[PDB]
Amino acid sequence: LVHVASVEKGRSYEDFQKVYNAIALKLREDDEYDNYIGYGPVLVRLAWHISGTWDKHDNTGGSYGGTYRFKKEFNDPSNAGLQNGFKFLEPIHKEFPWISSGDLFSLGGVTAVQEMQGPKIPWRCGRVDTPEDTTPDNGRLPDADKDAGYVRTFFQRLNMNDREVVALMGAHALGKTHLKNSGYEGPGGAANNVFTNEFYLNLLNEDWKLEKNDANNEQWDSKSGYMMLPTDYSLIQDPKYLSIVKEYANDQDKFFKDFSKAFEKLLEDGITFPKDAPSPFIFKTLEEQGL
Ligand code: HEM
């Protein structure tokens, strides 16, 4: 496969900035979801799960085809709970029927991070919806019950190296795990709907205790009321990953700069951009626009 980026016919920066402004205004408004966490966390988890099916060996999966819209990917056990992020974005797709599904699912993630006080993420338009038979089979998304060796081997299929993997995993400060979705339960820190380096600081400063939860799965619990997954806890058990965790814990700006670069790379894997294509757009936040 080659997947060439094609701009939605006739659309420019200001059209996309209107879809972003509409996702951000609805984030402001539906602030009660999941005990007042808001939809920001499930929207960046939707943007990474539609991108994480990519396989570098044959160019299949990835964000291009917007295939989550199909039953097979939608009903994938690893995608339980993302139906909430889909339902949120659906009125917005009726308001802007011209934007592709992959472009909308991925911009939902960019909007959520920037509106949660994260770094600016450059975003590129051009994904094209593809047929139901291009939909990737289930089982390409990662297990939580595993170690640092599995994590490194997994992220190599998306050719993400160590620093990219540690920066990307910093998004687990956001939101929480839910027992009925994944068999895990609990938050990862205090500020779980503001984007900060808190995941790293909690992983270095809490007194973590291994326990089984109500689903019979193990997780790392702390006195404070926080939890970490086995794969999260892996980042301080591996010596290469641990020097990077310490770097981000001492420097949130370096974390922002590296998360920005890696999240964009994750959203654009498997897509060729012609050089006639527009440069990546930097969207303004509501606040920047006075809205
Ligand atoms: C080895 C990698 C990863 C594994 C095994 C993993 C696993 C999980 C699991 C089990 C949950 C809880 C789901 C639930 O019960 O609702 C979760 C939540 C979440 N994940 Fe990951 N994750 C990984 C990588 C990432 C990456 C790379 C991102 C983002 C760049 C990400 C973002 C999120 C977000 C934001 C949540 C919170 C969702 C919410 O509050 O509803 N994860 N993850």
Curated annotation (Swiss-Prot):
Name this protein carries in UniProt: Cytochrome c peroxidase, mitochondrial
GO terms of biological process kind: cellular response to oxidative stress; hydrogen peroxide catabolic process; response to reactive oxygen species
Assigned EC number: 1.11.1.5
Species of provenance: Saccharomyces cerevisiae (strain ATCC 204508 / S288c) (Baker's yeast)
Assembly, per entry: Forms a one-to-one complex with cytochrome c.
Keyword hit for Transferase: no
Gene coding for it: CCP1
Residues noted as binding heme b in the record, renumbered to the chain: 172
Active-site residues, as the UniProt record annotates them: 49, 188
Site-annotated residues for Transition state stabilizer: 45
Catalytic activity annotation: 2 Fe(II)-[cytochrome c] + H2O2 + 2 H(+) = 2 Fe(III)-[cytochrome c] + 2 H2O
Residues of the full protein shown: 71 to 361 of 361
